[PDB]
Structure formats: structure tokens, C-alpha cells
């Protein structure tokens, strides 16, 4: 199957309460393997998966230096973007950045990406070709002109389709005993009366990895898009994920409903039905 390496960065200004909070997290697929937190004690990049701890001191020195350099640029950009958006020095604001790359099961490069946000909304993104940028508004276009003139895309591309791929391949080999697993979902249905005449049917998926999954409710084959309650996929805390989807049905009509489960780890899509006697 395919794999990804992604780094997530959040910088939050804290006017009058010190320098901005900076948190960086690195993932391979849905497994976190490094972190940096400006409010933590070490002020180092730190391991968060067993298979990265074998990296040597020169690895952690370089990761610490480069991730702190990202935090410095983000602190500068918080002030720059305050100016572009004509905001006061008093408020707290947020920059978020995600970048990374995908490889196929044979290790070939599939795609690279970088997306930036300001106060929770799109700011600027690298396009699929890794050659051009899309700014979200007229303020972000100022950044785009700067990055065009400085040939930032070419510099970033050499990382996204070069360095990123090389190290993702190394990590997949170093963590192969645990990153190549796909745990398919363990599924079941529950049933909860809400009155004498109605009940909730809840379709469960448990213990699956990766986190990507689809749960869908059909009535007589017709989808129930608007009457379905769907919760966000959530971590179990042991490396797997959980999700459920629910529908309120008339008592006695349970057998007219089916829940359909799709997961890359499932030989065939699962269909679940309440087993009324």
C-alpha cells in the first residue's frame, strides 16, 4: 500500500504572555514519530515512535536546528501577516503549516504538498505540479510574489520530491516491523430504544489502521445521508482508530436498514444488518 510522511506546524501568538507557542509533529502514515514543543523542557526534537530512537546524535542535532529555524520564520511571519491583514498587536493569531510526500508500495514518489493557513483559513498552497502557488486572497498574493521572486518553489520541490522521499523510504525500512501493518475494522451493530416506538441503530468500527474509513447507512438500498449521525474518527490510544455511525429507526422496521463499511484492509466491503428474530 501507499505511505506518507507529513509534518504539522502550529505557531500561536500570545501577546503579553511571552513568545509564540510553537508545536511541530511528524507522522509516517497515521503514526506520530517526532515532536517539538516550545513549552516543553528539552527544547529538542524528541522521538515519539520506537523505531526512530535508533537515530544518532547528529540526526537529533540537525532536526532540532532545522525545526527551530521553522519556528523563527513562523514568529516573523506572524508579525508580517498582522500587517498584511491590518490587525492590532493585541490579539492572538495562528499560523498552521503542513507539508509532506506520498510514495507508492514500490517506494516511488507519488506526490508532494505544502499548505499554509492563517487564523484557521487557507493562506497559500503549493500546487500539484510543485512549480506554482495558489494564494487564497489578495494579502496572500504578496507572499506569493515574494516566493516567486526568491524561487522558493524550486528549493522546496527538491525537498518534497527528493529528500522527503529518501527519508520516508528509510523510516519505512527502519520501522517495517510496525508501519507496514493494516488492521481491518472489527464491526458490529448496537440497538438503543429511545421510546416505545423508536430506536437508535449504531454501526461500529473498532481497532482499525490506517484511520481512513467509510461508514454508510442505507434503507432499502437508498442512502440515508441526511438522517445519519456520524462521529469523527477517533484514536483508541494504542495505535488504532474507532468510528461509529447511527440512524434513528421505527421500532419493528430495523431489518430495513444496512450499514456498509469500507476500509483498505477489508477483502470485501462489509454489510451489517440488525438480526431481528
Amino acid at each position: 500500500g501507499s505511505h506518507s510522511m507529513r509534518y504539522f506546524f502550529t505557531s500561536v501568538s500570545r501577546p503579553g504572555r511571552g513568545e509564540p507557542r510553537f508545536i511541530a509533529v511528524g507522522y509516517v502514515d497515521d503514526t506520530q514519530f517526532v515532536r517539538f514543543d516550545s513549552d516543553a523542557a528539552s527544547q529538542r526534537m524528541e522521538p515519539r515512535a520506537p523505531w526512530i530512537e535508533q537515530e544518532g546524535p547528529e540526526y537529533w542535532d540537525q532536526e532540532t536546528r532545522n525545526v527551530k529555524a521553522q519556528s523563527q520564520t513562523d514568529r516573523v511571519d506572524l508579525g508580517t501577516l498582522r500587517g498584511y491583514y491590518n490587525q492590532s498587536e493585541a490579539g492572538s493569531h495562528t499560523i498552521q503549516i503542513m507539508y509532506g510526500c506520498d510514495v507508492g508500495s514500490d517506494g516511488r514518489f507519488l506526490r508532494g504538498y505544502r499548505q499554509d493557513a492563517y487564523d484557521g483559513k487557507d493562506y497559500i498552497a503549493l500546487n500539484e505540479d510543485l512549480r506554482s502557488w495558489t494564494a487564497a486572497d489578495m494579502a496572500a498574493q504578496i507572499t506569493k510574489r515574494k516566493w516567486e521572486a526568491a524561487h522558493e518553489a524550486e528549493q522546496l520541490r527538491a525537498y518534497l520530491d527528493g529528500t522527503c522521499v529518501e527519508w520516508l523510504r528509510r523510516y519505512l525500512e527502519n520501522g517495517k516491523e510496525t508501519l507496514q501493518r493494516t488492521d481491518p475494522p472489527k464491526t458490529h451493530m448496537t440497538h438503543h430504544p429511545i421510546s416505545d416506538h423508536e430506536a437508535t441503530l449504531r454501526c461500529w468500527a473498532l481497532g482499525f489502521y490506517p484511520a481512513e474509513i467509510t461508514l454508510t447507512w442505507q434503507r432499502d438500498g437508498e442512502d440515508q445521508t441526511q438522517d445519519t449521525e456520524l462521529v469523527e474518527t477517533r484514536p483508541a490510544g494504542d495505535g488504532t482508530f474507532q468510528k461509529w455511525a447511527a440512524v434513528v429507526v421505527p421500532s419493528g422496521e430495523e431489518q430495513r436498514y444496512t450499514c456498509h463499511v469500507q476500509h483498505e484492509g477489508l477483502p470485501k466491503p462489509l454489510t451489517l444488518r440488525w438480526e431481528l428474530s
Partner: peptide
Amino acid sequence: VVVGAGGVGK
């Protein structure tokens, strides 16, 4: 590994 230091500001 993260990208190397030196990218320009916004």
C-alpha cells in the same frame, strides 16, 4: 527529516 533551514519569510 524536516526541510532544511533557509526558507524566506512570508
